[PDB]
Amino acid sequence: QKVVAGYFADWQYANAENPYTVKDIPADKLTHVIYAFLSMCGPHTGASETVQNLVAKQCEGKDPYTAIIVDTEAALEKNFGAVSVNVPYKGHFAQLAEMKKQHPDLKILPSFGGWTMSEPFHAMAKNKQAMDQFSKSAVELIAQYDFFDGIDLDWAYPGGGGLTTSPWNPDTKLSDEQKASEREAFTYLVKTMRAELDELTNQTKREYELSTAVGVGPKAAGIDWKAAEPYLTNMFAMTYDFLGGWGQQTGHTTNLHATERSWWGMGADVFINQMIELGIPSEKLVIGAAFYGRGWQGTKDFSGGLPTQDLVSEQGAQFGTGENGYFMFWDLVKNYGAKQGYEYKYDEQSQAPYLWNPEKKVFISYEDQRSIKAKANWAKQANLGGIFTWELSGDPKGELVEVMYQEMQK
Length: 410
Ligand SMILES: CC(=O)N[C@@H]1[C@@H](O)[C@H](O[C@@H]2O[C@H](CO)[C@@H](O[C@@H]3O[C@H](CO)[C@@H](O[C@H]4O[C@H](CO)[C@@H](O)[C@H](O)[C@H]4NC(C)=O)[C@H](O)[C@H]3NC(C)=O)[C@H](O)[C@H]2NC(C)=O)[C@@H](CO)O[C@H]1O
What we know:
By secondary structure, this protein is α/β, with parallel strands linked by helices.
């Protein structure tokens, strides 16, 4: 029984072209659904205005660093349809409670953080009392919403490299002292959260999981894994976003294998191996698959061959499924295929698919059945814990999940 996990983005239902809800999740093919994202009462200056307003609203009457539902309309209020369970809310959470009823062996986790809401962790990590309050209140939150099976932490990232903590910019790069403080704080956080969950177990007699995302390369090495790992169930390795429309460097976003043609030698295999070397047990590690792609326009010096280690484009694509530069899998299948002038290609050495439009000079890197099969099989051979996807709505048919399930649970 390997992990076959999917993230469920709380916001995706709002796209009329793919209004994906909890009722669309292929629950019988997953071991875990992870609800993205919750946060805490702390600074969100780097998030959208929408998110900052939602947070400020929820902060009313709560202590600093209290675990919160952010989009409460999505989570609790919007009617996604009647359910058999008698719960005093609607939203996605009523649907998750129903899903748990119909699929009792599925594990459902809330994820705290994510790219745009990691910022408050940096403030929380400065004080033990802040971390205690977040731990206490996060466990109270799942105790109240008792279809949840534990807690996932998606703090991008202790030691920096996230949205408000870029090392490439002088005034956001974290100091050595702050990196060190955050290293110790992450251990304390997971120790405290694990203890709080163990107390909940003593009350309810259920087992709870505590898991975390892990960034790649230097972003993994900001945590003391030898100290932290005993507290954690799974580490979800974010083996994606290697390249993107933020830079002119063009190539694979989530390639399984590093090659001599990779930009900067990147590939999921090399990053997973580093994580194991840092002291994450392979059997706790879960490789990441993407149900989206990224793309570039005005790709230079390229005729449709294999991508190389110096491939560049004018810029990231000024087009996307919603925000520019990324594409959900379903949008790629519908709108960026052969009939639209995009040639599907597969880099066998990398195990990664890409799309090349020769007339328009557009390059897209993504993930498909072939690469997911390859990643699941590699995970098995590397004695990993399983595979997960960011995020389920990219695959409305459930066809990519089916590959994850069949190939991992094999
Ligand atoms: C730990 C870590 O770094 N995890 C990574 C993921 O965070 C990351 O995926 C990105 O996650 C962002 C949130 O952290 C996503 O931001 C969402 O962006 C959409 C626009 O795409 C916003 O949109 C809807 O939101 C409200 C709520 O219903 C709705 O009313 C609005 O009309 C609608 N907005 C628009 C313009 O459509 C969301 O509010 C926002 N969410 C948050 C919490 O800020 C971002 O989309 C997502 N990027 C992806 C999927 O490519 C993944 C992938 O990079 O990597 C993990 O490592």
